């Protein structure tokens, strides 16, 4: 009925937006923002007896598509790091991968730094907070039939390209990155066809998507 959504990133100095959404009432019960990761103790009061969903920043996550080698669907996940080894900019052993979808001859993948994800879970565990789900913040945006769904959070633009594909980019180089966009916030002074949708609070909008979807990076080694 009610759940706490928390938006985290790799930047420990950056703010941590949170929001208590109620699917029963369809309303925002509580809302705030931690300044640093030093305030993780403050989330105790807002969690109480409610599931915690962590929204990792899509900027701190690799969301990409890869071709499944013919007739190797059952062993695909073991071959996943090696197929993406050239396409990531660090050692692929460092990343933890989660298959979001398998359709036709392609698979939808989400990678994240293993040590960061483990460290985030250890930070919440030290505070007595039990994280139920972890997913990319961009994938919590709603799908639109007329274009790419977008929303501004802080000084970043979240983009959901499709069901499993997504991204988060800074305002400074957002226009260069895009080279139609259904926007659920105030339109920027940038960009390339921006369709204005009814404006909502981004964390409230994301929370509604969290209630709809089942995606979670807590898989394999990170399963509860």
């Amino acid at each position: 009925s009610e759940f706490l959504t928390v938006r985290l990133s790799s930047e420990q100095y950056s703010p941590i937006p949170w929001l208590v959404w109620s699917s029963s009432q369809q309303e925002v019960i509580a809302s705030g923002e931690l300044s640093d990761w030093q305030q993780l103790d403050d989330l105790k009061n807002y969690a109480e007896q409610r599931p915690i969903v962590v929204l990792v920043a899509a900027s701190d996550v690799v969301l990409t598509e890869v071709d499944i080698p013919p007739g190797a669907s059952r062993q695909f996940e073991s071959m996943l790091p090696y197929l993406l080894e050239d396409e990531i900019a660090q050692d692929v052993d460092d990343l933890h991968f989660s298959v979001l979808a398998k359709e036709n001859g392609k698979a939808q993948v989400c990678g994240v730094d293993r040590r960061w994800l483990q460290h985030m879970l250890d930070a919440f565990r030290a505070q007595g907070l039990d994280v139920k789900r972890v997913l990319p913040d961009s994938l919590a945006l709603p799908l639109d039939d007329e274009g790419i769904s977008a929303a501004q959070l802080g000084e970043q633009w979240l983009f959901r390209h499709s069901a499993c594909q997504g991204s988060a980019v800074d305002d400074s180089w957002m226009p260069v990155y895009l080279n139609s966009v259904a926007c659920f916030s105030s339109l920027p002074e940038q960009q390339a066809h921006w369709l204005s949708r009814p404006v909502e609070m981004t964390m409230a909008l994301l929370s509604q998507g969290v209630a709809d979807g089942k995606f979670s990076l807590l898989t394999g080694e990170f399963k509860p």
Partner: protein
């Protein structure tokens, strides 16, 4: 810096306000991947293929010696003593009756030695020759440089009693973290400088997530970073590479843990050891045995207070006797956002606010420079617990947190008190100190 494999493939180079040079057509997927790895924003700049390839290739004892030429050794020892104490500037000044030398350590001047006045012209002559300056000329200012990885800038100037010399000591390493610039006070830095300089014992930097405990350890290791010491570390992961220090990374693919990595480090004949953190008893036991067998150990814990770190070692299973003999000190630390200097609004503190300390404090407000927060940047506030004779007794006897907090408040300032001093200076707000301090 990106990996060469990635940069060569997608045609993207990073050269530092970080600039990201690229060749068209730009790949949106690869652009996001660069943002993920750096954990920082950048400025994309388009470049032609020919100019890109060139950018890619270019990218990838003083005191004892004073009582006894002999001048050459004295000046070299003085410079070694300056780097030891962490001096920024060396002042050699000649008066009528007295020759005096002074260091400025973290902004604060200090008397080091006042030798015989007769030596005055010889010290001026030696320092000039090292910097390729004119020995005979004494009527004009002369400026020179030396490389010793220390880059000293030296300036002479005429005075009424000869010439006055100043040597500005600067490290060429641009990634050097100055512990005072990070936020430590001159007294806290000296006490921490002395603690990490010891031959053996454990030092713990504690605080919650994002308290700057890794950054403080790194700055401490960089200060010790010398060829006379063998410094090694186990990390999970390695935050960034310090040149000269051997950094091992924790690897679960070969079952290389903190404990197993720490044992391997101890067979490498180290002087100083740094363990990322002590999560379990196994790693704690090894770190304690290292400290009792002639190794300086540095690590971290996620406790809210400096005294909580001692209680944490107690709770993990380390025997009180072993904690008292091993532990040198605990550095409790928090980060507080620094107020924007352009838009910070002054206000006089009320009676409830004055209890914590016309007392003028500063508020956040906000403007386009901070955009639009009121703060810009961060700085550290600290509480350095120093394990002395009486602290060793209290750990052995198991006096508890309550009785131990009593004695600790008599000698060492609190983390709030250090924070409140910065509020008086106008660096951070009272709201930010009270946020991170409970």
């Amino acid at each position: 810096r990106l990996p060469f494999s990635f940069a060569n493939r997608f045609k993207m180079v990073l050269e530092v306000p970080p600039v990201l040079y690229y060749v068209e057509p730009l790949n949106a997927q690869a652009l996001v991947e660069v943002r993920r790895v750096l954990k920082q924003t950048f400025v994309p700049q388009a470049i032609a293929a020919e100019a890109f390839e060139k950018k890619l290739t270019e990218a990838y004892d003083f005191f004892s010696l004073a009582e006894e030429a002999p001048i050459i050794k004295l000046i070299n020892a003085m410079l070694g003593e300056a780097i030891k104490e962490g001096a920024s500037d060396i002042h050699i000044e000649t008066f009528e009756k007295i020759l005096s030398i002074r260091f400025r350590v973290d902004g604060v001047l200090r008397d080091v030695l006042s030798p015989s006045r007769k030596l005055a012209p010889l010290l001026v002559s030696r320092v000039k020759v090292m910097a390729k300056l004119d020995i005979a000329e004494k009527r004009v200012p002369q400026d020179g440089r030396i490389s010793l990885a220390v880059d000293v800038r030296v300036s002479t100037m005429p005075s009424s009693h000869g010439e006055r010399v100043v040597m500005r000591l600067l490290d060429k390493n641009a990634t050097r973290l100055d512990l005072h610039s990070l936020g430590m006070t001159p007294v806290n830095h000296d006490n921490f400088r002395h603690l990490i300089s010891r031959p053996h014992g454990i030092i713990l930097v504690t605080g919650p997530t994002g308290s700057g405990k890794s950054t403080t350890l790194y700055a401490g290791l960089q200060e010790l970073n010398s060829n006379e010491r063998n410094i090694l570390t186990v990390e999970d992961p390695i935050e960034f590479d310090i040149d000269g220090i051997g950094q091992t990374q924790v690897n679960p693919k070969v079952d290389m843990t903190f404990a197993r990595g720490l044992r391997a480090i101890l067979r490498q004949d180290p002087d100083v050891v740094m363990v990322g953190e002590i999560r379990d008893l196994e790693t704690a036991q090894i770190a304690v045995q290292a400290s009792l067998t002639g190794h300086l150990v540095m690590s971290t814990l996620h406790t809210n207070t400096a005294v909580g770190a001692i209680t944490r070692l107690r709770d993990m299973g380390i025997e009180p006797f072993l904690i008292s003999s091993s532990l040198l000190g605990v550095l409790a630390q928090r980060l507080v956002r620094t107020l924007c200097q352009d838009c910070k609004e002054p206000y006089e503190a009320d009676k409830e606010q004055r209890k914590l300390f016309a007392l003028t404090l500063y508020r956040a407000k906000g403007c386009e420079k901070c955009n639009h927060k009121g703060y810009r940047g961060r700085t550290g506030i600290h509480e350095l617990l120093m394990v002395d004779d009486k602290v060793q007794e209290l750990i052995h006897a198991e006096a508890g947190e309550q009785a131990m907090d009593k004695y600790i408040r008599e000698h060492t300032p609190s983390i709030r008190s250090d924070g409140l001093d910065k509020v008086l200076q106008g660096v951070t707000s009272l709201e930010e100190v009270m946020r991170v301090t409970k």
